[PDB]
Amino acid sequence: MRVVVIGAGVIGLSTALCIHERYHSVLQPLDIKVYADRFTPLTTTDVAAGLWQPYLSDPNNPQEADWSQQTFDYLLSHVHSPNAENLGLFLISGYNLFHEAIPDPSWKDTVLGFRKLTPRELDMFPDYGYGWFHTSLILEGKNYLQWLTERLTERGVKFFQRKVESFEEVAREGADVIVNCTGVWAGALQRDPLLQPGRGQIMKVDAPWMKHFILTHDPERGIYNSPYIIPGTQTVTLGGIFQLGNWSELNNIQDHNTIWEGCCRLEPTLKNARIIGERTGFRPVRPQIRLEREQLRTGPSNTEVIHNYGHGGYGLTIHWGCALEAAKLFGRILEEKKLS
Amino acid sequence: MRVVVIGAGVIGLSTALCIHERYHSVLQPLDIKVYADRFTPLTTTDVAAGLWQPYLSDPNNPQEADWSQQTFDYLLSHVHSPNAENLGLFLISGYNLFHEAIPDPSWKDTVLGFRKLTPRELDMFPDYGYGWFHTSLILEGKNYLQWLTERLTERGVKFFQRKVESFEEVAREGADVIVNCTGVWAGALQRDPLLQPGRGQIMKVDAPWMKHFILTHDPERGIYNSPYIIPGTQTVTLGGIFQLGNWSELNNIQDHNTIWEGCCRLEPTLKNARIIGERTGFRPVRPQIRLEREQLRTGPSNTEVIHNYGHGGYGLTIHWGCALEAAKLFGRILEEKKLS
Numbered sequence: 001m002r003v004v005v006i007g008a009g010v011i012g013l014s015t016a017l018c019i020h021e022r023y024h025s026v027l028q029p030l031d032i033k034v035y036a037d038r039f040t041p042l043t044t045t046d047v048a049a050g051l052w053q054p055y056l057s058d059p060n061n062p063q064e065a066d067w068s069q070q071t072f073d074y075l076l077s078h079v080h081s082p083n084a085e086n087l088g089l090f091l092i093s094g095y096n097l098f099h100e101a102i103p104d105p106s107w108k109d110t111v112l113g114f115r116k117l118t119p120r121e122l123d124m125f126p127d128y129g130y131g132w133f134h135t136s137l138i139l140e141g142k143n144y145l146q147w148l149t150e151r152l153t154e155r156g157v158k159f160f161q162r163k164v165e166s167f168e169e170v171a172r173e174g175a176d177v178i179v180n181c182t183g184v185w186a187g188a189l190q191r192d193p194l195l196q197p198g199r200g201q202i203m204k205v206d207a208p209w210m211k212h213f214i215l216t217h218d219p220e221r222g223i224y225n226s227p228y229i230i231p232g233t234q235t236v237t238l239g240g241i242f243q244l245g246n247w248s249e250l251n252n253i254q255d256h257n258t259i260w261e262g263c264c265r266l267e268p269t270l271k272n273a274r275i276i277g278e279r280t281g282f283r284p285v286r287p288q289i290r291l292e293r294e295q296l297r298t299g300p301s302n303t304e305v306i307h308n309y310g311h312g313g314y315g316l317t318i319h320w321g322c323a324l325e326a327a328k329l330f331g332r333i334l335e336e337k338k339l340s
Numbered sequence: 341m342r343v344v345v346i347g348a349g350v351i352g353l354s355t356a357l358c359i360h361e362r363y364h365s366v367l368q369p370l371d372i373k374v375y376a377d378r379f380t381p382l383t384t385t386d387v388a389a390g391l392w393q394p395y396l397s398d399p400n401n402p403q404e405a406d407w408s409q410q411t412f413d414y415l416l417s418h419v420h421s422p423n424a425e426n427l428g429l430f431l432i433s434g435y436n437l438f439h440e441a442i443p444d445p446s447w448k449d450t451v452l453g454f455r456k457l458t459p460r461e462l463d464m465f466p467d468y469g470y471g472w473f474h475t476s477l478i479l480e481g482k483n484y485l486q487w488l489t490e491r492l493t494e495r496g497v498k499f500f501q502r503k504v505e506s507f508e509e510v511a512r513e514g515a516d517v518i519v520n521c522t523g524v525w526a527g528a529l530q531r532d533p534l535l536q537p538g539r540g541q542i543m544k545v546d547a548p549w550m551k552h553f554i555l556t557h558d559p560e561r562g563i564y565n566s567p568y569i570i571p572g573t574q575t576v577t578l579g580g581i582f583q584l585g586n587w588s589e590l591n592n593i594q595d596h597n598t599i600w601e602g603c604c605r606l607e608p609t610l611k612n613a614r615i616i617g618e619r620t621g622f623r624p625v626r627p628q629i630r631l632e633r634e635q636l637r638t639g640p641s642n643t644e645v646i647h648n649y650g651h652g653g654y655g656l657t658i659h660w661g662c663a664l665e666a667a668k669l670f671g672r673i674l675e676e677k678k679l680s
C-alpha cells in the first residue's frame with residue numbers, strides 16, 4: 001500500500017498525518033511519502049497569520065461549516081497542553097468592524113463569547129459603526145508546519161523535494177494512492193477553471209502591545225481586501241490585500257502603502273511600530289473546496305486520487321476537518337480494495 | 341507659592357502633573373518640586389503590572405468608585421493616541437475565575453463588554469467553576485512613570501533625590517503646601533495605624549503567546565493571594581502573593597514556587613516560559629485611601645498638607661481620579677489664601 005501525498009503546506013501535512021495515525025495499525029506495508037516542490041519556510045501556509053475565522057457568508061457546500069467546526073473543537077481541546085507553544089496555538093480575542101448592521105455569522109456558536117460591539121467600543125473606531133467581538137484561536141502557519149513535520153518524521157513518513165509533472169508519472173513509479181494537496185497550483189496537474197489565486201500581501205510588524213485582532217470589512221472592496229491586524233506570537237500581522245488572478249509572487253510597493261495606511265488609520269499607535277518582514281502568497285480560491293476521489297485511468301489498473309485543495313482564505317481554519325474527510329475517503333478505498 | 345510633592349510613584353507624579361496643568365496659569369510664582377527617596381525604576385509602582393481593576397467588593401468610601409471610573413474614562417480616551425506606547429497603555433481582555441457564583445462587580449459597566457463565562461470557556465480551567473470575561477486596560481507602571489517624568493520635566497518641575505525626615509523639615513525650608521504621596525511608608529512622617537504593607541511578589545516571564553489576563557479568586561486565601569497572569573507589553577506578570585504586615589523587600593524562594601506552581605496549574609503552556617525577572621513591592625493597604633487636607637501647625641503660620649496615600653492593590657487603577665481630587669483640594673487652599 002504505497003501512498004504519495006503531493007503538497008507540504010498545511011493541507012498535505014495534516015492529511016498525511018491524519019491518514020497515518022488512522023491506518024498504520026490496519027495496514028501492514030503502509031508507506032507514506034510526501035512529495036513537495038516547496039517546504040515549510042516557503043509555502044503559502046507560511047504567509048498566513050493563522051487566525052481561525054471562516055468567511056462571513058454560508059459555504060456553498062454546508063459540509064465546510066462542519067469541517068471548520070471540527071477544526072476549532074480539536075484545536076481548542078489542545079490549547080492547554082504542554083505542546084501548544086510548539087504548534088504555535090493560542091487564544092486571541094478581537095473585533096470585526098463594519099459600516100452598517102449585518103447578520104450574525106453561521107459560526108457564531110463555534111467561537112467563544114461571540115457578541116455585538118457596545119457603543120463604547122465602537123467609539124474607538126471613527127470609520128466604523130458596527131461590529132462584533134469574540135475570542136477565537138491562532139494557529140501560526142510556520143510553527144504548525146514544523147510541528148506536523150517532526151510528527152510525520154517520527155512516524156516514518158519520508159519527504160522528498162520534487163515537482164511532480166503529472167499524476168501518471170507518480171502512479172507509473174508505483175503509488176497505489178495519490179493525495180493531491182497542491183493548493184493554488186492544482187491546475188498544473190489537472191485543469192480546473194474554478195481554481196484561481198487570491199494574491200495576498202502581508203507585513204510583519206513589532207507591536208507587542210497589540211493584544212486583539214481587528215478585522216475590517218468593506219463590501220465595496222471585497223473580503224480580505226480591507227485592513228486587518230492580527231497579533232501573532234512574536235510579531236503582528238498587518239494586511240488587507242486580496243487580488244483575484246494575480247500570480248505575481250513579489251512584494252508590491254502599492255500594496256505595502258495600502259497595508260500601512262489602512263492599518264495606521266485603524267490603529268494609530270502602529271506608526272511607531274518596527275517593520276520586520278513582508279511576504280506574498282496565493283490563497284487558492286474556488287467556489288468550494290475540492291475534496292473528493294477520482295480513479296485515474298493509467299496503465300493496467302487505475303490508481304486512486306484524493307483531491308484536497310482550494311481552501312482560499314481559510315485553510316488553517318478548516319484544515320483538520322478536511323484531513324479527517326480525506327482519511328475517511330482513504331478508508332473507503334481500502335474496503336473496496338478488500339484490505340480492511 | 342512653593343509646592344512640595346513627597347513621593348515619585350504613580351501617586352506623587354500624577355498629582356504633581358495634575359496640579360501643574362490645572363494651576364500654572366492662575367499662579368505666577370508657582371514652583372513645584374518633587375522630593376523622593378526612590379525613583380522610577382525602584383518604586384512599588386514599577387513592580388505593578390498595571391491592570392485596571394478595582395476590588396470586587398464595594399469601597400468603604402464610594403467616592404473611590406468614581407475615582408476609578410474617572411481614571412478609566414481618561415485612559416480609554418487616550419488608548420488610541422500615538423503616545424500610548426510611550427505611556428505603556430493598551431487594551432486587554434481576560435478572565436476572572438471563581439469556584440462559586442458571586443455577584444457582578446460595581447464596575448461592570450465601566451469595563452468594556454463585561455459578561456459571564458460560557459461553559460465552553462470554563463472547560464479550559466478545571467479548578468474553576470464560574471467567572472467573568474471583559475476588556476480592560478493596562479497602564480504599565482515603569483513606562484507610565486517614565487512618561488510622567490518627561491512631562492513634568494518639560495514643565496520645569498524639579499526632582500530631588502532625598503529622604504524627608506518630617507513635614508516640619510520641609511515647611512522650615514520654605515514650602516507653603518506639601519503633597520503627601522509617600523505610599524506604604526507614610527506612617528514614618530505621621531503615625532497611621534490603619535496603613536499597612538500588603539507585600540506582593542511577582543515573576544516576569546517570556547510568554548508572548550499569552551494575550552489575556554487571567555485572575556483567580558479564592559475567599560479561603562483572599563484577594564491577590566490567588567494565582568494571576570497578566571501579559572504586559574514585553575513580558576508577562578506571574579503573581580498571587582499578598583501578605584499583610586510583611587516588610588521584607590526581598591524575593592522569597594517559597595513565594596517564587598507558589599507563583600510558579602499556581603500559574604502553571606492555571607496555564608500549563610507556561611512550563612516552557614523563560615523567567616526574566618522577579619520583584620517584590622508593598623501594597624499600601626488601608627481601609628480607605630487617605631486623600632484629605634490637614635493644616636500642620638508649624639512655626640509662625642501653619643503649612644497646608646494634602647495627604648494622598650493608601651491606594652493598596654489599586655493605585656494605577658485609581659490614580660487619575662485621586663490626582664484630580666488632590667488638585668481640587670489645592671484649589672480650595674488657594675481661595676482661602678485669597679490667591680485665585
Ligand SMILES: Cc1cc2nc3c(=O)[nH]c(=O)nc-3n(C[C@H](O)[C@H](O)[C@H](O)COP(=O)(O)OP(=O)(O)OC[C@H]3O[C@@H](n4cnc5c(N)ncnc54)[C@H](O)[C@@H]3O)c2cc1C
Nearest residue numbers: 007008009011037038044045050051164183200315316317
Ligand atoms: C495572506 C494570507 C493570510 C491568511 N490568513 C489565514 C488565516 O489568517 N486563517 C486561515 O485559516 N487561513 C488563512 N489563509 C489561507 C491559507 O494561507 C491557505 O488557505 C492555506 O495555506 C492553503 O494551503 P495548502 O496546503 O492548500 O497550500 P500551500 O500551503 O501553498 O501548499 C501547497 C504545497 O503543494 C506543493 N505543490 C504544488 N504543486 C506541486 C507539484 N506539482 N509538485 C510538487 N509539489 C507541489 C507546494 O510546493 C506546496 O508544498 C491566509 C492566506 C493568505 C494568503
Ligand SMILES: Cc1cc2nc3c(=O)[nH]c(=O)nc-3n(C[C@H](O)[C@H](O)[C@H](O)COP(=O)(O)OP(=O)(O)OC[C@H]3O[C@@H](n4cnc5c(N)ncnc54)[C@H](O)[C@@H]3O)c2cc1C
Nearest residue numbers: 347348349350351377378385390391504523540655656657
Ligand atoms: C506585586 C504588586 C502588584 C501590583 N499590581 C497592581 C496592578 O496590576 N494594578 C494596579 O492598579 N495596582 C497594582 N499594585 C498596586 C500599585 O502598585 C500601588 O497601588 C501603587 O504603586 C502605589 O503607588 P504610590 O505612588 O502610592 O507609592 P510608591 O509607588 O511606592 O511611591 C512612593 C514614593 O514615595 C517615596 N517616599 C516614601 N517616603 C518618603 C520619604 N520619607 N521621603 C522621600 N520619599 C519618600 C518613595 O521613594 C517613592 O518614591 C500592585 C502592587 C504590588 C505590590
Ligand SMILES: Oc1cccnc1O
Nearest residue numbers: 200224239283313314
Ligand atoms: O488575508 C486573510 C486574513 C485572514 C484570513 N484569511 C486570509 O486570507
Ligand SMILES: Oc1cccnc1O
Nearest residue numbers: 391540564579653654
Ligand atoms: O497584585 C495585583 C494584581 C492586580 C492588581 N493589583 C494588585 O495588587
